[PDB]
Every structure is written in structure tokens, then in C-alpha cells.
């Protein structure tokens, strides 16, 4: 059999991907952490633009070249992911 097929039909696909995880948290995990919190959009939009560390690990997030409006749009989108 083709390996890409066995990967699928023995369930390996359920637990393994080809590519390594990226350094920052997944957006669905961010959405889960901040769900229902009144000020979450404003908090995240500031983090997205200015960066920071310590919440998810020791690795610092760099500032990003976004307007404050884009930072808010991205915040709202990330929180939306379920």
C-alpha cells in the first residue's frame, strides 16, 4: 500500500502531521483561553501589535507592523475560532 494511504486508514492521521509546530500558540488555543472575557479583544489587539512574552512560554513575541484597527480585526478573528 501507499504510505500516504496507510497514514489515513490506520488512524495515524488523527495524531500526527508532517510539519513541526510553530513557535507561538495555535489560534484555536488562544480562542479557548480568552473565551467569554469582556476585555479580551483589546488585550489581544495590544499584544498583537506590541508583542510581549510570558503568557505561553519564555519566548518573546515581537512587535508587528499592523495598524491598531488591523490588530483588532485579527484579535476578533482569532477569538472566533472554534
Amino acid at each position: 500500500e501507499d504510505p500516504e494511504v496507510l497514514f489515513k486508514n490506520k488512524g495515524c492521521v488523527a495524531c500526527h502531521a508532517i510539519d513541526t509546530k510553530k513557535v507561538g500558540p495555535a489560534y484555536a488555543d488562544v480562542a479557548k483561553k480568552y473565551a467569554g472575557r469582556k476585555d479580551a479583544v483589546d488585550y489581544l489587539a495590544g499584544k498583537i501589535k506590541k508583542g510581549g512574552s510570558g503568557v505561553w512560554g519564555s519566548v518573546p513575541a515581537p512587535p508587528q507592523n499592523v495598524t491598531d484597527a488591523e490588530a483588532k480585526q485579527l484579535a476578533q478573528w482569532i477569538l472566533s475560532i472554534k
Binding site: 500500500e1 504510505p3 500516504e4 496507510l6 497514514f7 490506520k10 488512524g11 495515524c12 488523527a14 495524531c15 500526527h16 502531521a17 508532517i18 510539519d19 513541526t20 509546530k21 510553530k22 513557535v23 507561538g24 500558540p25 495555535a26 489560534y27 484555536a28 488555543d29 513575541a61 508587528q64 507592523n65 499592523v66 488591523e70 480585526q73 485579527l74 478573528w77 475560532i81
Partner: protein, 80 residues
């Protein structure tokens, strides 16, 4: 949205979905590159299970023949 996030470089450091429970195959292949006995070793671990290498969560045994296990082991080790 996703396009804006791609555009601004965010996806270099972030995915949409949580990491899967087991290690990525490119990481398994890179760990074992040039290691004698790796295909055998992995075939065995795919068949019989593994814990403590990549995390606290065990991989349970999988019901594969020594052929299906070897096939998958070779393909994993070729992921680059």
C-alpha cells in the same frame, strides 16, 4: 482573517489548530537521519507503542503487520 494574518507574517509563528498529540514526522525523520537501525526501531514502536520520547502521552500499539510497519517507518523517515 486568514489572508490578513498570512499577509502580515503571522503564520510563520502560528497555526490555526492545536498541535496534534504525537510528534511531527519531519521531526521524527530528522532525529533518526543517518542512524543505524532506525527503520527497525520505528517499525517496532509503530507496531507496539511508545512513551517518554516526545512527551508524557503514550502512543498505543497499532494493528499492523511487520510489512505495514516497515512501509510506514520508511515513509516517516523520508519526511524532509
Amino acid at each position: 482573517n486568514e489572508q490578513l494574518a498570512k499577509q502580515k507574517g503571522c503564520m510563520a509563528c502560528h497555526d490555526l489548530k492545536a498541535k496534534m498529540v504525537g510528534p511531527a514526522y519531519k521531526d521524527v525523520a530528522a532525529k533518526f537521519a543517518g542512524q543505524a537501525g532506525a527503520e527497525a526501531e520505528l517499525a517496532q514502536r509503530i507496531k507496539n507503542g511508545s512513551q517518554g520520547v516526545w512527551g508524557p502521552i503514550p502512543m498505543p500499539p497499532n494493528a499492523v503487520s511487520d510489512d505495514e510497519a516497515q512501509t510506514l517507518a520508511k515513509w516517516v523517515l523520508s519526511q524532509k
